[PDB]
Amino acid sequence: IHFGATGKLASADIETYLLEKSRVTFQLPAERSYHIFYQIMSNKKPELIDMLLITTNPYDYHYVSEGEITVPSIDDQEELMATDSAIDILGFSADEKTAIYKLTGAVMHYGNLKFKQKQREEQAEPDGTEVADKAAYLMGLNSAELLKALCYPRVGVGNEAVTKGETVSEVHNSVGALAKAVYEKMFLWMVIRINQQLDTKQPRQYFIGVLDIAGFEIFDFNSFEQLCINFTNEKLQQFFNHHMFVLEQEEYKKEGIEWEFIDFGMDLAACIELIEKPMGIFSILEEECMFPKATDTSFKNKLYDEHLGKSNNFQKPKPAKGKAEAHFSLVHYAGTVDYNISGWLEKNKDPLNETVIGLYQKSSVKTLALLFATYGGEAEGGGGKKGGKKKGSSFQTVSALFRENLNKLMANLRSTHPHFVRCIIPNETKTPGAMEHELVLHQLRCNGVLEGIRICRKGFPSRVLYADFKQRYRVLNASAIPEGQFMDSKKASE
Amino acid sequence: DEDETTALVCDNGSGLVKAGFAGDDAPRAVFPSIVGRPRHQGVMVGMGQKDSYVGDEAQSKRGILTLKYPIEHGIITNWDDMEKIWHHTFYNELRVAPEEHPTLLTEAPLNPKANREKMTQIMFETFNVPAMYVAIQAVLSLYASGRTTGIVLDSGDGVTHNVPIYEGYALPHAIMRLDLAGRDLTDYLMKILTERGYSFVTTAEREIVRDIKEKLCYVALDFENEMATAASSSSLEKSYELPDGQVITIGNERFRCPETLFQPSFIGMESAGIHETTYNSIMKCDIDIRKDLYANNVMSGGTTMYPGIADRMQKEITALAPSTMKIKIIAPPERKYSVWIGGSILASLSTFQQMWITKQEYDEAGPSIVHR
Amino acid sequence: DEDETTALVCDNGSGLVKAGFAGDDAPRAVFPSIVGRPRHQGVMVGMGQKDSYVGDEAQSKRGILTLKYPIEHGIITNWDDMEKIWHHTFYNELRVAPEEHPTLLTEAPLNPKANREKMTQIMFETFNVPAMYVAIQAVLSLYASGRTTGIVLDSGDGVTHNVPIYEGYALPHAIMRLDLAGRDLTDYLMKILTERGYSFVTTAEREIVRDIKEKLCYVALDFENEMATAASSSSLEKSYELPDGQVITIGNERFRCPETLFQPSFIGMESAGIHETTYNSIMKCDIDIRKDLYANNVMSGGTTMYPGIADRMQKEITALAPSTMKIKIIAPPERKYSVWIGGSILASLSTFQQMWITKQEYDEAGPSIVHR
């Protein structure tokens, strides 16, 4: 929030990180996908249903009814408008506001796209042009061209373009990949477009950043996504530990106490280097992604040969307890996290059928066309089989950005006066006035709260803020303590 | 992005330089590996006196300059003239300033230790690049075809090589070099085409024999009963129209030119040919790794692009290999840039960052550091 | 169940480890008894730097590591490298945590007192197992064939032994050790097969001579008129197809290899052979127990698996033994795991619980406790 010179509002700026792409295609049993879907099928704007070519029964869209469909505390009908109206205010063009919708339905349809094995062949052949037709139209595509590209992905290995055939299992999976890809991008776009409106000409002198992200969560199962988040947090933490070190040291300087101490951040640098540094996890992760014939297993070994025994924060797992398999544990400030490396290579490659993307790139639906541009502009760079996508501006890592973004962030965080807020969850059971112990205890460790207490206690435990000191104790020598507190917020307590 | 965008990949050849940004799919810059030095004093209209010319301006103006090739058979032979080609690559071709770009370079198969140290000395000390890295060419070609073990038959403009690679380490004692490549091959076509009763008299006749070789040449399988076919005279013939009308016909010689790669005897070479050499490399390697190499004959290089090269090689080594073996000749379409693409991939990769030799490593360890 | 499920059985050999859970019918884990140490610095793609390799990863990657065998002739010779093979067995092969599993181990026939105390020191003090037990190998083989008195001819990869056992107590002064086994036997086949006019040149040729020995080798009875038979050339010959087509033929040598076990003179050994040694063990024992040993020649070990080994031994000792005697050569089918199976039985047994050495016994009595 970009405040002006006077002190009055001037601009805003959003940025999104780590979106749960999987919901779009999946959902746990007690959960559900994004609201939008359920919003739309609610039927408050019936045109929409016919416009998108869907029904009102979600069980027609596998992608979105794997879990639950309705939530009592939510009124999908009301929201639909909220949403709707917001779009408008947000300045979107009707068309775009149309793309959004139309595009959000295509995705539903995709999950309905079905295929079958060609006879005597292990190839995938379309099981009908019922749905494709809709998906095609809704996206400003051609049914055929689409089903081909999907089935007979025309690749470019060597210096040419080699037409490759896919399996049934391969298609279903690629489709899902686009569905997710498209949704994401779109989401990104919306944000940008928002930002665009939120751009004013008026001068800006300062801003107030409000960061909302998740905190270090430990699961019996920790995959790639966990690393990314944990890493984010372990950084954020150090960010604090330092600010505190800086802060602390001012007092002892203001007062005249004689206390020497090392930055509290330092304690964490070990873990961070191991992740972000050159021969660290990410790198080994993002290099192997360049090897056309690497395995998760391959990656794994590379991870060890290089860090095992040589690095302290690096460890081989404890396979048992509440954990599900073995690969590698790390020693984060909050504790030991047991990480499972399986899918990483892929997840990190963001494999997308480029033939299809092609089609998008030349859609009749501008917006859809837009969203893909940046893929179309780096292809120059990865023209032949093997090599480096980055030559043409294509991502080389699933992780290559995350880092870039996370840096651009932690940098923005520095030219800032950090203000901290830790949100807590009392009981899994949803009951006011109650608290499970160990549940809150957990949070406290991973929060930073327990670490702030530590650093405090190194020493001089309890530390009173001056006003907080005045008010509560003025009364003790009432005349002389009140005068002190009022006369100089600090000098007072003195 | 700092260097995600920023990594350069320069593949130095005997005939062509291939260059561009790690990330791209193909080289942003491709140009001859020449440095022309004017035979006389004078100027072009509007320009100043130029001491030197590089790449295409050296080729185009060849009549008034003495042309020189810095890389003889894949090895850098003149370091004054190579620093000139690099300068041209960064500043004119890619138009980047080198002092803020990491640079991945390539070297040849048994490139002398001292050279890898010298181009590092010139990269860091005269171009002041942040960091650099030298990959071996066959090794980038393999890797660009996804794999890590295989044997690459690599063939460009001045050299042919066989580099058996196992889990990434190129095997020094099994590497074979055959000094007959596309350059030799254009000059042989030249003679079998003048010998067909022709004349490549002016320089506009000379240059295009090479464009005939690229467009119309073939590697026939059963080159035996292809000559026999030539004689019955089928519609096998192929006429090309010259810079002007002068429609030249090439029927037969069309494949007599790549049959030189299997029979070096066509050109007074006593060395063995491509397929035998693939094989000999292979019976020079460990026994347990020979099934791997056989199912992974990756081809790269401009001269391996002749259609039907792969089928001839397929059958050439099946019939020399023990029948218990699986033969497999991979020849991708982008193969004239395999090497480069393998570098683009590798250098844009997420894990490569920790192998870049930085000026910190260098200023502290000497050229020895990158030499490995 | 606490330990009914939970007892481990680890049989440490000169060539192979056999491991698994007491209760099972056969070893869950079988793998070479090697520990590889990399000759150079570097990595596999995706892995980290590895200091060491064990079992099959050491065999597969043998070209870049220095391979070492911890057990020479059945005795543990390097304790740093053995603790490495045990670690691998528990944690990677059986994937169990050792500190909650009783462990039955095996040792060799005249295993030095000090070793049985040392592996106990390492089992309890570095692996922290709840309880353990060391059985003698021939003794588990016998017992797995139901009985308690007999003489075991035990023959694996580095040693052969004869261990006369009476009501369970192996008889120290009658035990014979012959250092010629399956390892020696693969290398002799190697030479009689190169000598047949062949070449096991690459490592993929070396390894498979051992698979020829296992699949096609025989112990003929009347090895005399089997050579004679070879000459008339019957359909006695046998061709094996190599990793590739290269069909190699082995007619005769097929049995010249196990005739080495009866004639050590085939390999420049001056020692006596298997059958004479069975016998000599027996005329070194008490007189009254010799009818028992003769009717209970139990065979165990990978190298006693050559078909017709039992018939040759049957007739070999009948014709050395007094005719008043009953000869009986028991050779079961699972014999390459007799030792292990005998341990599985014993350790899963209802009465064995009271012989387990517990950490209570150890922390209180020192390694002496299990040593007996």
From Swiss-Prot, chain A:
Residues 1-494 form the Myosin motor domain. Transmembrane segments: none annotated. Residues 406-428 are annotated as: Actin-binding. It is found in: Cytoplasm, Myofibril. The modification N6,N6,N6-trimethyllysine is found at residue 300. Belongs to the TRAFAC class myosin-kinesin ATPase superfamily. Myosin family. Muscle contraction. Myosin is a protein that binds to F-actin and has ATPase activity that is activated by F-actin. The rodlike tail sequence is highly repetitive, showing cycles of a 28-residue repeat pattern composed of 4 heptapeptides, characteristic for alpha-helical coiled coils. Limited proteolysis of myosin heavy chain produces 1 light meromyosin (LMM) and 1 heavy meromyosin (HMM). HMM can be further cleaved into 2 globular subfragments (S1) and 1 rod-shaped subfragment (S2). Muscle myosin is a hexameric protein that consists of 2 heavy chain subunits (MHC), 2 alkali light chain subunits (MLC) and 2 regulatory light chain subunits (MLC-2). This is Myosin heavy chain, skeletal muscle, adult. The chain holds residues 253 to 746 of 1939 of the full protein.
UniProtKB/Swiss-Prot annotation, chains B, C:
Its EC number is 3.6.4.-. The modification N-acetylaspartate is found at residue 1. It comes from the Eukaryota. GO terms for molecular function: actin monomer binding; ATP binding; calcium ion binding; calcium-dependent protein binding; cytoskeletal motor activator activity; hydrolase activity; identical protein binding; magnesium ion binding. The modification N6-malonyllysine is found at residue 61. One of its GO terms (biological process) is positive regulation of gene expression. It is found in: Cytoplasm, Cytoskeleton. The modification ADP-ribosylarginine is found at residue 177. CDD domains: ASKHA_NBD_actin. PROSITE patterns: ACTINS_1, ACTINS_2, ACTINS_ACT_LIKE. The modification N6-methyllysine is found at residue 84. Oxidation of Met-44 and Met-47 by MICALs (MICAL1, MICAL2 or MICAL3) to form methionine sulfoxide promotes actin filament depolymerization. MICAL1 and MICAL2 produce the (R)-S-oxide form. The (R)-S-oxide form is reverted by MSRB1 and MSRB2, which promotes actin repolymerization. Can be mono-ADP-ribosylated on Arg-177 by SpvB of Salmonella spp. This modification blocks subsequent polymerization and leads to cell death. SUPFAM superfamilies: Actin-like ATPase domain. The modification Tele-methylhistidine is found at residue 73. SMART domains: ACTIN. Residues 110-123, 358-370 are annotated as: Interaction with alpha-actinin. It catalyses: ATP + H2O = ADP + phosphate + H(+). The keyword Amino-acid biosynthesis does not apply. One of its GO terms (cellular component) is cell body. Actins are highly conserved proteins that are involved in various types of cell motility and are ubiquitously expressed in all eukaryotic cells. In vertebrates 3 main groups of actin isoforms, alpha, beta and gamma have been identified. The alpha actins are found in muscle tissues and are a major constituent of the contractile apparatus. The beta and gamma actins coexist in most cell types as components of the cytoskeleton and as mediators of internal cell motility. Belongs to the actin family. This is Actin, alpha skeletal muscle. It comes from Oryctolagus cuniculus (Rabbit).
